[PDB]
Design a binder for this molecule. Structure first.
Ligand code: FAD
Ligand code: FAD
Lengths: 583, 83, 170, 169
């Protein structure tokens, strides 16, 4: 029997897509989700390292910005389904709450650039210690603060403009989206102040040259910004969805046949069935310890009315179909830069960082670790174990290839050591989880070596468990996507929902959203497709206030009418007070 | 344990370099082997000599991290001083 | 306790041991102003926190701003948070760098938990001078008994009074 | 040899592709007086040895007073003396800190034998790329970048060898 819809890819996008549908048009049509692997959740991944059963080591996604009271701002989509599906949410701390009286937050968090050690406070407290030749003008601003000085320097209020107006803002006689990110900053910053921001701010070696219209209002990552991660780990959402999908009572197909995993789509083809012009030739895929490889068996073919592709860029690029030949879709699949993502977790029986007045957040360095995050201690967790077991996350670099986090992926594997807190509860062959990638006796040793240095230490307590993961492998060939420059994201954000009209194929995913590298981006792309192209309405849990996607400017960015400025009397005033801070 | 010779002093006490050592050793030596009572002035709470660990700690049961919510706060706050 | 309560039943005269200064009456220097003369540079107890520049020991960055006591306390919380908040039995069961803490000689731990300069420092600035003991760290680490707020007492008639009064009484 | 002798048979002209100044000819300053502009501080190739205070890299005491081309050779011998004069066959059996050297990327080595301020240095002052973690057995004796080594260029442009190879075909 054939399928009316085939939501291919089990990402947060897919899992949301199939749910609402079956919920509404599921007794009305044959809906089925198709997964590559043995695991739902996609990039959202949530393992509990042994001994840290209540300290989630989200390999993939971790947090989400709470919704504002006007609901037009904040990760609105995420933060209302987290209530609707009723999922437990704790604060994701970036700073230290202690001291209760005068919370230092991230101010005291560490910096080790150019072989000199300081803290986030030493920016606004004693710039003398920054070992960068920042020109007078620039001397005295924090990485975040600086980006905003620049932004303002461009078109005051750039952060206040809707995407539409933003796109039209030129700088030095060019559209802001025609510049990359660095290409821009290497004309507004001293070549040190350039280098300096490239060594600290937001992610890491990332912040790749990307459309300035996306990457210039990317200052959100500060220590004043509230954030929440699901108690059960971010993978919780796109599993409760995956469950809830198959748990809809009214359905042509029962829950047992609805979620078809270990099915990798290789060819979308135009069939002969004028009602199902989609001959999908899948292939059997087996998952042994995170490593899913193909079972040559037979290419199982299922007939589909429409295929809602919940896939990021490589994932798509991996299907052979005449559909990708469409000249638009040929040249608009390269609208986004693939950028790999690595990550190391290390479990300790003592959060040695606390002894050194660092709690949560990150620390930055010219060392290959580049980054390091202090997560939490098992017993600090609400009704956790009575262990001082804790988690340090890292390897959060982010670069093209052959770096130094792929240079130690070989040797012998790290087996770790049975903590006292897991004696006879788990075995030293079972302490270090078997993942797709197995962190080596070598990569652990160097990481630790490096971590030590970062924190100006002589020797730290050896970790007992450690997992490494990467998103540089197909079916992703990259962690998160960033919009390239000399592209019209505004339009593509709309037209990637339906690249080809005549054809009833819909692509959903953060990979072509406004919320790129955010779960919001994948929910939004799906929801605004369900609504427009599947006529599903605004549900009760979503406000109408939250515009799902941003205003596309006209195609006529040729010499349009000039943007009538607003409360300059305000704008310019906030812009000038913001420069008294750095003086 | 065959003989009736008893050793008291500061040398083999948890109170090394202090008097209290001398006084604590002696008392327990008396309370235990000389059948003396506990001076009405010496409070029941004060444990004289500390208690030992089991003679097999080769695989010790993990200490119950009773209160970290408190301990890790102070350890941290102690650090903020030297900044 | 035994001394504080024995000197009680013996009804012997108690007086404060001032390990520091009582003036000015408003806000005492305690010690703070007390002298040091290490590595041919003079400084005061305050200048450890107030003015670390002035300390002639090239300590590491994480080590600057403490006193020799304070530093010890950091190290101890390093070895294991709330090591002083335990019993002796529990303390014998704490392991650092694989070894039970009580198999380490003091110094032989410091050097692996501190900078040499910080090592020397603490060996050039301690309570009982030449703490040199490489003594079972389990005992000599939580020696947080040396400050300007730590209350001490003496005997008016001197500490020899306690033995004599017993001998008399005996 | 192949390129020098093929240009030989093909009788194509050669010029000395110059890497430094031959002025003065009393004492050519080679490239010593050539420019360097890192970490918003300017200096020369002579400043590396003549005035290592001028180099704005907080490198270790052991590394101070070497030019980067000279520091590569320090690393090599530190690893093993003579590598350069070994045969590939032998250079494959050479091991560092346990692993054979060819199991090391060019930087997964540097960050183990150099300081991070030596690691970052060599980078900035090689083609940033340099090796992007190329096998270390090939990229370690890359110490022919000097103005001390010789280099010849085709007068009619290098493309004249493959063109002249096509025509004679
Ligand atoms: C390192 C990292 C950190 C992040 N941190 C955060 C964060 O803190 N907060 C936040 O909000 N967001 C974060 N994100 C973003 C988050 O991961 C994304 O929002 C989300 O996971 C992407 O959903 P998607 O539907 O676009 O695709 P994905 O979740 O990537 O799903 C793609 C799916 O397609 C499947 N697939 C691939 N090929 C085929 C095929 N041929 N046939 C069938 N199925 C196939 C895959 O198996 C996979 O299940 C992070 C991302 C990364 C990489
Ligand atoms: C410089 C210094 C400073 C100190 N400061 C303090 C302090 O501030 N506070 C504090 O609480 N403690 C302090 N102490 C320690 C304290 O004085 C002792 O712990 C205390 O005297 C212990 O008495 P004891 O009976 O254990 O040993 P002791 O005082 O040594 O008593 C042993 C007695 O036996 C006698 N004796 C030895 N051999 C023989 C023998 N063969 N035959 C007969 N008699 C013998 C000795 O002569 C002596 O009278 C200090 C010690 C020193 C050295």
């Amino acid at each position: 029997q054939p399928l009316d819809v085939a939501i291919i890819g089990g990402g947060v996008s897919g899992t949301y897509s199939a749910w609402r549908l079956q919920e509404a048009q599921g007794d009305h049509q044959r809906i089925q989700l198709f997964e590559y692997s043995d695991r739902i959740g996609g990039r959202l991944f949530s393992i509990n390292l042994p001994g840290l059963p209540n300290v989630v080591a989200e390999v993939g996604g971790m947090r989400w910005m709470p919704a504002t009271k006007d609901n037009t701002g904040g990760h609105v989509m995420v933060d209302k389904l987290v209530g609707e599906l009723k999922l437990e949410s704790k604060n994701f701390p970036m700073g230290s709450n202690l001291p209760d009286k005068d919370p230092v937050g991230a101010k005291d968090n560490l910096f080790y650039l150019r072989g000199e050690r300081f803290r986030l406070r030493d920016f606004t407290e004693a710039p003398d210690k920054i070992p960068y030749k920042l020109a007078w003008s620039e001397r005295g601003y924090g990485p975040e603060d600086l980006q905003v000085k620049v932004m303002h320097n461009i078109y005051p209020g750039f952060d206040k403009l809707s995407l539409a107006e933003q796109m039209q803002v030129k700088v030095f006689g060019k559209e802001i989206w025609r510049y990359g990110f660095w290409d821009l900053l290497y004309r507004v910053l001293s070549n040190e102040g350039y280098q300096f921001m490239k060594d600290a701010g937001g992610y890491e070696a990332n912040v790749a040259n990307a459309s300035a219209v996306t990457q210039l209002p990317a200052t959100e990552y500060s220590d004043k910004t509230v954030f929440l991660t699901l108690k059960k780990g971010f993978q919780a959402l796109p599993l409760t969805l995956a469950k809830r999908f198959a748990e809809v009572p009214g359905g042509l197909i029962a829950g047992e046949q609805r979620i078809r995993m270990n099915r990798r789509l290789a060819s979308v083809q135009f069939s002969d069935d004028t009602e199902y012009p989609y001959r999908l030739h899948f292939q059997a895929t087996r998952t042994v310890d995170g490593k899913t490889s193909d079972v040559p068996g037979a290419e199982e073919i299922i007939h589909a009315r429409q295929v809602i592709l919940a896939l990021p860029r490589r994932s798509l690029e991996l299907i052979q179909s005449p559909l990708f030949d469409d000249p638009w879709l040929k040249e608009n699949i390269d609208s986004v830069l693939v950028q790999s993502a690595f990550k190391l977790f290390l479990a300790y029986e003592q959060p040695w960082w606390r002894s050194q007045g660092l709690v949560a957040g990150r620390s930055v360095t010219d060392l290959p670790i580049r980054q390091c995050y202090y997560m939490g201690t098992e017993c600090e967790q609400d009704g956790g174990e009575k262990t001082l077991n804790s988690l340090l996350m890292a390897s959060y670099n982010d670069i093209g290839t052959v770096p130094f986090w792929k240079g130690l992926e070989d040797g012998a594997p790290f087996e770790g050591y049975q903590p006292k807190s897991l004696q006879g509860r788990i075995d030293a062959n079972e302490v270090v989880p078997k993942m797709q990638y197995q962190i080596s006796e070598e990569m652990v040793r160097i990481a630790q070596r490096q971590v030590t240095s970062l924190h100006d230490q002589i020797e730290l307590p050896a970790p007992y468990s450690a997992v490494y993961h990467a998103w540089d492998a197909d079916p992703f060939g990259g962690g998160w996507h960033e919009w390239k420059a000399n592209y019209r994201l505004d339009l593509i954000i709309q037209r990637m929902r339906h690249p080809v009209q005549e054809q009833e194929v819909y692509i959903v995913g953060e990979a072509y959203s406004y919320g790129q590298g955010w779960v919001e981006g994948a929910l939004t792309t799906a929801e605004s497709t369900l609504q427009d192209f599947f006529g599903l309405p605004r549900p009760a849990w979503l406000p109408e206030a939250y515009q799902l996607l941003p205003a596309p400017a006209p195609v006529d960015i040729d010499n349009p009418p000039a943007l009538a400025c607003t409360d300059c009397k305000k704008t310019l005033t906030e812009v000038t007070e913001f420069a008294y801070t750095g003086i």
